[PDB]
Structure 1
Amino acid sequence: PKVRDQSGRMNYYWTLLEPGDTIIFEATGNLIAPWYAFALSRGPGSGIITSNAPL
């Protein structure tokens, strides 16, 4: 069935490449390739707030 008028689908995936490690992409087709990625250091651990209160 169509969703946003699309019968096709794109499945999205992710991983946290550790410092020093290498990630390798190999494709014969159908790859939605990465273009920009994120360099981050995780904090102690928090959560999401859902609100309309102004910052």
Structure 2
Amino acid sequence: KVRDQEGRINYYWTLLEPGDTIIFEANGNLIAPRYAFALSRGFGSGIINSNAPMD
């Protein structure tokens, strides 16, 4: 029981290319997308794990 639950939701993601179609078929057990995100790649960066004020 993680977080007072025993069933699990497995999460998946994909990157639709410009001018491409995604098809969802399901007869059960689908947590459907509602909000997607439009992205443009930037300079290679990372994530900083820190406890410091932002200025």
TM-score normalised to structure 1 length: 0.92
Structure 2 match to 1:18: 17
Q: Percent identity?
A: 87
- C-alpha deviation, 1:44, in angstroms: 2.0
Deviation (angstroms), 1:3? 0.8
Report matched runs for 1:1-55 at 5 Å: 2-55=1-54
Gaps of 5+ in 2: none
Q: Secondary structure at the residue paired with 1:40?
A: coil
1:6-41 deviations in whole A, cap 9, x for unaligned?
Answer: 010000000010011111110010000000010010
The two structures, once aligned, show a CA RMSD in angstroms of 0.7
